[PDB]
Write an enzyme that holds these catalytic residues in place. Structure first.
Site, PDB file in Angstrom:
ATOM      1  N   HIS A  62    -128.431 -19.774 -75.712  1.00  0.00           N
ATOM      2  CA  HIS A  62    -129.707 -20.332 -75.535  1.00  0.00           C
ATOM      3  C   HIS A  62    -130.174 -21.296 -74.292  1.00  0.00           C
ATOM      4  CE1 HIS A  62    -127.349 -23.923 -76.870  1.00  0.00           C
ATOM      5  NE2 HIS A  62    -128.312 -24.515 -76.450  1.00  0.00           N
ATOM      6  N   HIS A  92    -128.065 -30.296 -69.638  1.00  0.00           N
ATOM      7  CA  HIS A  92    -128.484 -28.954 -69.645  1.00  0.00           C
ATOM      8  C   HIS A  92    -129.766 -28.996 -69.464  1.00  0.00           C
ATOM      9  CE1 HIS A  92    -128.681 -30.518 -73.587  1.00  0.00           C
ATOM     10  NE2 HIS A  92    -130.021 -30.265 -73.598  1.00  0.00           N
ATOM     11  N   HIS A  94    -134.098 -27.033 -70.482  1.00  0.00           N
ATOM     12  CA  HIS A  94    -135.042 -26.564 -70.982  1.00  0.00           C
ATOM     13  C   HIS A  94    -135.926 -25.892 -69.939  1.00  0.00           C
ATOM     14  CE1 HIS A  94    -133.323 -28.191 -74.658  1.00  0.00           C
ATOM     15  NE2 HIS A  94    -133.124 -29.138 -74.076  1.00  0.00           N
ATOM     16  N   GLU A 104    -139.899 -30.005 -73.084  1.00  0.00           N
ATOM     17  CA  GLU A 104    -139.893 -30.253 -74.335  1.00  0.00           C
ATOM     18  C   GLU A 104    -140.682 -31.606 -74.891  1.00  0.00           C
ATOM     19  OE1 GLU A 104    -135.654 -30.379 -76.098  1.00  0.00           O
ATOM     20  OE2 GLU A 104    -136.201 -28.319 -76.465  1.00  0.00           O
ATOM     21  N   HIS A 117    -131.925 -32.799 -69.853  1.00  0.00           N
ATOM     22  CA  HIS A 117    -131.078 -33.923 -70.659  1.00  0.00           C
ATOM     23  C   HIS A 117    -129.757 -34.014 -70.253  1.00  0.00           C
ATOM     24  CE1 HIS A 117    -134.333 -32.135 -73.861  1.00  0.00           C
ATOM     25  NE2 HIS A 117    -134.885 -33.127 -72.972  1.00  0.00           N
ATOM     26  N   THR A 196    -132.599 -31.760 -80.006  1.00  0.00           N
ATOM     27  CA  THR A 196    -133.873 -30.704 -79.940  1.00  0.00           C
ATOM     28  C   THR A 196    -133.090 -29.102 -80.263  1.00  0.00           C
ATOM     29  OG1 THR A 196    -133.732 -30.222 -77.855  1.00  0.00           O
ATOM     30  CG2 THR A 196    -135.209 -32.263 -78.543  1.00  0.00           C
ATOM     31  N   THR A 197    -131.827 -29.104 -80.502  1.00  0.00           N
ATOM     32  CA  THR A 197    -131.337 -27.835 -80.699  1.00  0.00           C
ATOM     33  C   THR A 197    -130.599 -28.083 -82.349  1.00  0.00           C
ATOM     34  OG1 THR A 197    -129.090 -27.871 -79.803  1.00  0.00           O
ATOM     35  CG2 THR A 197    -131.014 -26.686 -78.702  1.00  0.00           C
TER      36      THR A 197
END
Ligand code: ZN
Length: 258
Positions: A62, A92, A94, A104, A117, A196-197
């Site tokens: 992802h 990582h 997003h 996010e 993040h 958030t995952t």
């Protein structure tokens, strides 16, 4: 039907396997600057990345993650709203299918091109896996990315991504200094929330920086050349791997500034 960011398994579906998705302390959130509360008692953040030791970079499916040696005791986030010290384990990002979305957290509904993040775990708890089982287990530093001038400290990341295009691929990623990903100012908003995952655990003190870093169009476009799929599988470009804002519910977002 492992969770991901397709139409069939995306954020709207996660609650079926992870019912905490509809919980009381979920992330990300929209930061409404009028309703956030300036707290003059909030102290400066302390981010010490001088001796951080990067190891490898991995395409997890992802997203990609850069992993650190968290046996180091000096690569630590502390201060600010925190009552403990937290060790950097990975970072990582997003991002979106275009520059107009990808973050996010949002600020008065504004969406940034991406969000970084930096994930840290509380040294009270022994390791990451044990920390996420505690309400104060993680401290995550979130940093918005906007498109403009290039961020030199991001280039080593951008340059390596072509080598880890598909899920399961990885590369050596030593000697990377994450100081190069920080803006000048460390003014921040902060609130209690979640990963958030999946598994979406409610174990995070969020610290979101007011100042975005500038990255070039070229740099962020490289992110979009990654793939969700494995080698030999039909190509599915890795884009729009951001969970949208979730309800703030009881919580109070505080700021180190007005
Ligand atoms: Zn994240």
């Amino acid at each position: 039907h492992h969770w991901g960011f397709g139409k069939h398994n995306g954020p709207e579906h996660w609650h079926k396997d992870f019912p905490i998705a509809k919980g009381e302390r979920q992330s990300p959130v929209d930061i409404d600057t009028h309703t956030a509360k300036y707290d003059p008692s909030l102290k400066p953040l302390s981010v010490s990345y001088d001796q951080a030791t990067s190891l490898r970079i991995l395409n997890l499916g992802h997203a990609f993650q850069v992993e650190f040696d968290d046996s180091q005791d000096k690569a630590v986030l502390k201060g600010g709203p925190l009552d403990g010290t937290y060790r950097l384990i990975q970072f990582h990002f997003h991002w979106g299918s275009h520059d107009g979305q990808g973050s996010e957290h949002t600020v008065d509904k504004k969406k940034y091109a991406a969000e970084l993040h930096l994930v840290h775990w509380n040294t009270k708890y022994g390791d990451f896996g044990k920390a996420v089982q505690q309400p104060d287990g993680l401290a995550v530093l979130g940093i918005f990315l906007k498109v403009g001038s290039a961020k030199p400290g991001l280039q080593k990341v951008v340059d390596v991504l072509d080598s880890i295009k598909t899920k399961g691929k990885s590369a050596d990623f030593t000697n990377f200094d994450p100081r190069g990903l920080l803006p000048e100012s460390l003014d921040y908003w902060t609130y209690p929330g979640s990963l958030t995952t999946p598994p979406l655990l409610e174990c995070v003190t969020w610290i979101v920086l007011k100042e975005p870093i500038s990255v070039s169009s070229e740099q962020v476009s490289k992110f979009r050349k990654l793939n969700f799929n494995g080698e030999g599988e039909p190509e599915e470009p890795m884009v729009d791997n951001w969970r949208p804002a979730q309800p703030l519910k009881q919580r109070q977002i505080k700021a180190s500034f007005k």
